[PDB]
Amino acid sequence: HDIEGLKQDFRLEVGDILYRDVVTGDVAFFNRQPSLERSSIGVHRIVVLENPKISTFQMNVSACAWYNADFDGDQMNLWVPWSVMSRVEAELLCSVR
Amino acid sequence: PSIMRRLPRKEGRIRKSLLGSQVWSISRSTICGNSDLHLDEVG
Amino acid sequence: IVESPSICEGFVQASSQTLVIIPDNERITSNVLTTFEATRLVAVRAQQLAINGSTMLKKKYSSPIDIAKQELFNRKIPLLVMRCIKVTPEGQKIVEIWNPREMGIPLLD
Amino acid sequence: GEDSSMDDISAYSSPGLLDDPFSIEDVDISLDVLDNLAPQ
Numbered sequence: 442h443d444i445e446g447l448k449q450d451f452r453l454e455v456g457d458i459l460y461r462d463v464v465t466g467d468v469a470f471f472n473r474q475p476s477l478e479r480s481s482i483g484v485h486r487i488v489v490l491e492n493p494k495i496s497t498f499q500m501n502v503s504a505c506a507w508y509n510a511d512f513d514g515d516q517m518n519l520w521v522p523w524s525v526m527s528r529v530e531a532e533l534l535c536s537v538r
Numbered sequence: 539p540s541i542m543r544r545l546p547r548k549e550g551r552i553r554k555s556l557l558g559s560q561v562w563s564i565s566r567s568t569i570c571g572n573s574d575l576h577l578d579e580v581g
Numbered sequence: 582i583v584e585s586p587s588i589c590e591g592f593v594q595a596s597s598q599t600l601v602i603i604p605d606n607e608r609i610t611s612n613v614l615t616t617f618e619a620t621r622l623v624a625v626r627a628q629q630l631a632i633n634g635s636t637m638l639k640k641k642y643s644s645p646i647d648i649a650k651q652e653l654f655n656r657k658i659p660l661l662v663m664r665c666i667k668v669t670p671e672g673q674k675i676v677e678i679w680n681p682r683e684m685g686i687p688l689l690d
Numbered sequence: 691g692e693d694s695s696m697d698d699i700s701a702y703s704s705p706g707l708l709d710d711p712f713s714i715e716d717v718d719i720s721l722d723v724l725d726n727l728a729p730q
């Protein structure tokens with residue numbers, strides 16, 4: 442069901458699946474190609490930038506050592522886990538710590 | 539065009555459709571510096 | 582004379598197996614969960630809570646992941662870890678049954 | 691010996707001419723993100 446075509450419900454029914462927006466504090470897999478080391482894909486806590494004019498993936502400069510990255514024009518992938526099973530394992534196994 | 543031509547090379551069946559994958563729910567953008575973010579945080 | 586194929590040979594379905602559980606005193610694997618096993622336990626419990634939601638955790642949390650983590654930490658998780666040791670040609674499947682309520686959890690919180 | 695109708699087509703070009711060392715064939719990187727390989 443859509444959310445714009447469905448506005449007659451006071452609350453939700455138990456068992457439903459809600460596809461909510463990504464918020465600050467969510468974990469995300471963050472990758473740069475080529476992936477040579479196994480630290481090339483790491484899990485970071487998302488900080489959502491409220492500025493509508495920002496279109497870049499910002500990270501601390503000390504975090505570039507994981508990905509062998511720099512800011513001369515590199516592009517990096519990012520996918521946010523949504524499944525509970527994949528979201529658990531991102532926090533416990535794939536965290537950049 | 540042949541059935542067995544689909545297999546071998548990098549753009550072949552094995553290395554492009556099986557060992558690799560096109561996925562949804564993924565994003566790409568240029569990276570940037572931000573000294574106010576933690577090492578385990580991404581803007 | 583090696584003759585034409587018969588029905589005795591040519592079976593595709595593998596024969597069924599008998600689960601042989603090693604006794605507790607004769608176990609060799611470690612009494613400590615690996616990070617892989619702990620992560621799998623927490624993920625499975627979180628998904629099942631997302632399905633059912635019935636838990637005996639006394640505290641209250643608003644996420645299946647947190648509830649699963651606290652269940653693992655409080656040793657109240659309804660799961661077992663079966664470590665497959667060997668599949669014997671005669672049919673037996675020797676495994677190890679470990680209880681995560683009496684093993685050391687490697688996670689941190 | 692004065693005919694040109696059935697001359698070899700490939701002979702009008704200049705006559706004459708296993709792994710490519712400079713080809714990224716076993717490197718699985720998207721062709722749209724090749725700037726990560728810049729020497730910088």
Ligand SMILES: [Mg+2]
Binds near residue numbers: 728730
């Ligand atoms: Mg670069």
